[PDB]
């Protein structure tokens, strides 16, 4: 298929940009990352930092995941992110998203060898 680390990268990494510049950022990215393919994914966060900086979070502050697992880590510093959330009017296959650019800590679930991010838990 796709490995768990490769899938995290495709759904959440966007280092080519420093921040979302238009309210159209989410509609374009959700589409080009093939996240509106079978349905409209309701919520998705893009991180605008290098892959190495995001991978480094697996060695930062260990916190519990929203599901109760303890393989979640919170970044010591804030990072540039973009939250994409489907609007109330969105309907497959005409997906519409609201873009919210912000700077905040990210929380990720890590695993394997090497121990890398495999799930985006929350931003705070």
Swiss-Prot record:
Q: How does it assemble?
A: Interacts with and forms tight 1:1 complexes with RNH1. Dimerization of two such complexes may occur. Interaction with RNH1 inhibits this protein. Monomer.
Look up keyword Secreted and say if it applies: yes
Organism equals Bos taurus (Bovine)
Q: Which major enzyme category is it?
A: lyase
Q: What is this protein's gene name? A: RNASE1
The record lists substrate as bound by 7, 10, 41-45, 66, 85
Question: Could you give a single Gene Ontology term from the biological process aspect?
Answer: defense response to Gram-positive bacterium
Which function does this protein serve?
A: Endonuclease that catalyzes the cleavage of RNA on the 3' side of pyrimidine nucleotides. Acts on single-stranded and double-stranded RNA.
Does the record bear Signal in its keywords?
Answer: yes
Q: Which GO terms describe its cellular component?
A: extracellular region
Keyword field: Disulfide bond, Endonuclease, Glycation, Glycoprotein, Hydrolase, Lyase, Nuclease, Secreted, Signal
Q: Give the organism's phylogenetic lineage.
A: Eukaryota, Metazoa, Chordata, Craniata, Vertebrata
Please write the reaction equations for the catalytic activity of this protein.
an [RNA] containing cytidine + H2O = an [RNA]-3'-cytidine-3'-phosphate + a 5'-hydroxy-ribonucleotide-3'-[RNA]; an [RNA] containing uridine + H2O = an [RNA]-3'-uridine-3'-phosphate + a 5'-hydroxy-ribonucleotide-3'-[RNA]
Glycosylation site residues:
1, 7, 34, 37, 41
Cysteines paired by S-S bonds: 26-84, 40-95, 58-110, 65-72
Question: Which EC numbers characterise this protein's activity in its record?
Answer: 4.6.1.18
**Name the record gives this protein:** Ribonuclease pancreatic
Identify the tissues in which this protein is expressed. Answer: Pancreas.
> What does the sequence similarity comment in the record state about its family?
Belongs to the pancreatic ribonuclease family.
Which span of the parent protein is shown here? Answer: 27 to 150 of 150
* Protein's cellular compartments: Secreted
Where this protein primarily resides, as one coarse class? secreted
